[PDB]
Design an enzyme around this catalytic site. Structure first.
Site, short mmCIF file in Angstrom:
data_model
loop_
_atom_site.label_atom_id
_atom_site.label_comp_id
_atom_site.label_asym_id
_atom_site.label_seq_id
_atom_site.Cartn_x
_atom_site.Cartn_y
_atom_site.Cartn_z
CB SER A 16 -1.50 -0.08 1.47
OG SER A 16 -1.75 0.57 0.80
CD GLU A 24 -5.17 -4.20 -3.95
OE1 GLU A 24 -5.29 -3.47 -2.97
OE2 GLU A 24 -4.11 -4.91 -4.52
CG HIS A 80 -5.59 -2.66 0.36
ND1 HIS A 80 -4.49 -2.13 -0.61
CD2 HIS A 80 -5.30 -1.84 1.48
CE1 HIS A 80 -3.96 -1.64 -0.83
NE2 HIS A 80 -3.84 -1.08 0.86
#
Ligand SMILES: *[C@@H]1O[C@H](CO)[C@@H](O)[C@H](O)[C@H]1NC(C)=O
Ligand SMILES: *[C@@H]1O[C@H](CO)[C@@H](O)[C@H](O)[C@H]1NC(C)=O
Lengths: 533, 535
Positions: A200, A324, A437
């Site tokens: 990330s 995601e 995610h």
């Protein structure tokens, strides 16, 4: 006094601790300081190198987590608490951790340097999912991770000022990489083979080191998991950083010099209290204080820099997870929750889009809606929910990743891409979020090798595979097992063929085109739709 | 009389007729060819609405096709059947308002459902006398009464100075309606049933059919409609009053010519002069655009087709609608550089972007780019075969497939019973290159049952397939339902709904039901593009 656990770095002596990994012992040196504590008049300032110390510094425990917002939305829930600080908060947080095999490597060993995520507003190198003992034990990796300043403390900028020049959190990372160059040999690390990896915001940071020349002589390879320096959330302009800082100061009651001096007088929690009040629109996947295009660390926008850069002697691994966007919807999109199936209406979907794409004009938002609506089933609640997830993931991660992969390959870099498709059996989040995610990380760091964690036996075998790709990539710039025929092979990603692999319990499968039609919409058309309006 | 075949002498409102006994494969049929239904629209009548034909004395010989309406003749590929089959096959003359009737032989015992054919050809060409329109097979095999009429095309049929008296516009549509009125009055003399009249047509013929649905005075003249590869809505079937005035004024200037004076000058011009300049009036370089077409006059068409389908009541209506597999391919050789009938037409990306400007002539720069981004295959963006087929699909989808989808959807949502097809069999006898797939206009020969003529060289499978299509069409004319009431063995053709979006494939294989008529792509043309062009 185990002489394996005694190291002389440039600043003096350290005492590590011998830790237990399922296959043997490892040496861990935790909480090693690489900077002067950035407290008092050092708030918002570039980090200074740590002063030499006397005697033997105790490096057997993790140090404090950098001062940050703490997530409260779901109290006691392991799915959120796993990302929360697991040590005391403090502005005195500039420490790194080193894991090595035990005994320490006989010869120079490739170094992996981990940079956590958390949207530039949270994170810490001490969370269980970043435990470097497995990689150290199974693969003989020397693993490094650092703390870096987040939120206002790392990223609040009054561009052009002396006392808030922006990007100090990235400078924190740069100093820790400098420290690795100067010191890692003492641990048996090889400073001539440093691979950065991160997820990330950690990935976008990796990307910014790729795009910043002073960083380029501190590593050789990079891995970007579910994040990129390019895209809508990882940078802001000079003007918009100035604006958010000025607004945060007004909110806490405070000439640049004078503004920053008053900000320095404020308790840490006061700044955090108003962190979230500075975003120009109601949004998700948008963060208040992030790296700024300053003309310094970042000479231009990431967009400009990746378009024109030369990446000839560079190897890169990039990838995304299957879902995601799911995670983010519960943090502000009406109709979404972890406690049910979040089946939305059409109206909820149009409203969700203005929130997921906060920068989008009425027409652009229309374009998004029209593209993600399945016209065979326009009102089907399941489709609408999955599409909302997809809008968010594509716009924030997948399409920025595709763009990055393409530019790097076209400009001489050696690129490998993946999609991660395995949902952890131990997942706390509901099924509709799929593979969210952040949930590849535990597999890469090798947690399923810890029997007490209750991962399936197939998941342990999967973890072993991933540690191998990652460390092979660290060793050679190529994730393929160099002493193993049959895989089938993981091929380089290239703009012509666009090959990438799925990582899941089944053997590697080669696919072509990473959301190619949909990313064409985000990467090529949408920019023209706003740039004319 | 006394010596003639007693079964070929019929009386209509205008007088006595003698028709001809024709050979069809399964036996004889009655044909009455070249029946006048209007006063010749010549001289001071050019551009004027049609006046009904004045009664004649004696027996009119109705044994041959009559003149074709004055029109542009295609010469792009001289000698080539692919183009010649669509060309005038009788003398060109402004005196052309004639119609044709085929009936079983002897004429049927009880009132028989009537099929009325309206030919296409972009509103600038066509003729009811062409071989692919031969009504002999439908008459002999299905017992149908089939009627087809000539109607004015080009300037003679559509040049409009809207609001004027001397050129009101839409007069070609009025020719069509007059022949519909002729059928109401006269068709029973042939054994036809004026209470079961079904309109069918292809391309501009289909647009025409849809306009008769949208124009109330035509509504009482028929009961059911088939629209084949064309709709009244969409980018080419109509022009605004403003745009028609512009084109009529320009065409006037080009031949060297207050509305009364202009029209009076145009009336002194020879027919060929007008045809010679009719292509010089289009606002851009384009394909699938025609100079003189139906105009939104606020009379025949009280508002835009798009407005009228969105707010109309279609409770009582039964419609059959559909498309061929490759609607656009044909159009590409008449104006997009890179394309030809004589090679594979493998084009470059540059030739694609240029082809999009010509094929979507009304598109701004943004929209053109939107079209290109949508139709590009981003895995193989420079692949010539893909670019060739994408160029085709752009033109097919924009002009036919997506207008048809819009129509089926809007009519269904509003009460109509709608059946929907895609026609996918390429004639074995086709003379266009293979890349063109199943081109626009190439289902017609099957609906009309030409493959039943042994001398035509179709496969046995094609003959059977043709019989199946003739069954569907005439079932739908008979009942409003293409399915056979008995035959429950053959798979069923479900109606098209907004909820389920069902349609059938028409090929050598048994009916297969598919869902969604290019659903994703048609959202681009029908929902996105209009908004993009409002900015
Ligand atoms: C095919 O024919 C056309 C027209 O003669 C020509 O313009 C085109 O270049 C040809 N295509 C190719 C590349 O063979
Ligand atoms: C049909 O086939 C025969 C035999 O080849 C041929 O003589 C005849 O002219 C053909 N008719 C056409 C081309 O329609």
């Amino acid at each position: 006094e185990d002489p394996q656990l005694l190291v002389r770095v440039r600043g003096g002596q350290l005492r590590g601790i011998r830790l237990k990994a399922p296959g043997g012992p490892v040496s861990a040196f935790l909480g090693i300081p690489f900077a002067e504590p950035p407290v008092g008049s050092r708030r918002f300032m570039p980090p200074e190198p740590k002063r030499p110390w006397s005697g033997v510094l105790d490096a057997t425990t993790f140090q404090n987590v950098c001062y940050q917002y703490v997530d409260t939305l779901y109290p006691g829930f392991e799915g959120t608490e796993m990302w929360n600080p697991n040590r005391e908060l403090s502005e005195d947080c500039l420490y790194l951790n080193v894991w090595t095999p035990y005994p320490r490597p006989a010869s120079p060993t490739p170094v992996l340097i981990w940079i956590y995520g958390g949207g530039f507003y949270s994170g810490a190198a001490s969370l269980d999912v970043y435990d470097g003992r497995f990689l150290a034990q199974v693969e003989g990796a020397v693993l490094v991770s650092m703390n870096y300043r987040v939120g206002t403390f790392g990223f609040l900028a009054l561009p052009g000022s002396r006392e808030a020049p922006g990007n100090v959190g990235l400078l924190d990372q740069r100093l820790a990489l400098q420290w690795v160059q100067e010191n890692i040999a003492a641990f048996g690390g090889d400073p001539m083979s440093v691979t950065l990896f991160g997820e990330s915001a950690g990935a976008a940071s990796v990307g910014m080191h790729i795009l910043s020349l002073p960083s380029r002589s501190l590593f050789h390879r990079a891995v970007l998991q579910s994040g990129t320096p390019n895209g809508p959330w990882a940078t802001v302009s000079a003007g918009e950083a100035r604006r958010r800082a000025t607004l945060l100061a007004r909110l806490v009651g405070c000439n640049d010099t004078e503004l920053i001096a008053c900000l320095r007088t404020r308790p840490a929690q006061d700044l955090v209290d108003h962190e979230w009040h500075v975003l120009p629109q109601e949004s998700i996947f948008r963060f208040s204080f992030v790296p700024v295009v300053d003309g310094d660390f970042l000479s231009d926008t990431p967009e400009a820099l990746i378009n024109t850069g030369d990446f000839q002697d560079l190897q890169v691994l990039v990838g995304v997870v299957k879902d995601e966007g799911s995670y983010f919807l519960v943090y502000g999109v009406p109709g979404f929750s972890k406690d049910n199936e979040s089946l939305i209406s059409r109206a909820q979907f149009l409203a969700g889009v203005r929130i997921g794409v906060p920068q989008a004009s009425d027409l652009a938002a229309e374009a998004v809606v029209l593209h993600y609506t399945d016209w065979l089933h326009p009102e089907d609640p399941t489709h609408l929910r999955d599409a909302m997830s997809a809008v968010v993931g594509d716009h924030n991660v997948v399409c920025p990743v595709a763009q990055l992969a393409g530019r790097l390959a076209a400009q001489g870099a050696r690129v490998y891409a993946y999609i991660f498709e395995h949902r952890a059996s131990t997942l706390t989040w509901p099924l509709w979020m799929g593979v969210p995610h952040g949930y590849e990380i535990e597999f890469i760091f090798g947690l399923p090798l810890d029997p007490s964690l209750n991962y399936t036996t197939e998941e342990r075998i999967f973890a072993q595979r991933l540690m191998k790709y990652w460390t092979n990539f660290a060793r050679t710039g190529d994730p393929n097992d160099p002493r193993d025929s049959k895989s089938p092979q993981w091929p380089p990603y290239t703009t012509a063929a666009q090959q990438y692999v799925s990582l899941n319990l089944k053997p590697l499968e080669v696919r072509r085109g990473l959301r190619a039609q949909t990313c064409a919409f985000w990467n090529r058309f949408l920019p023209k739709l706003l740039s004319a309006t």
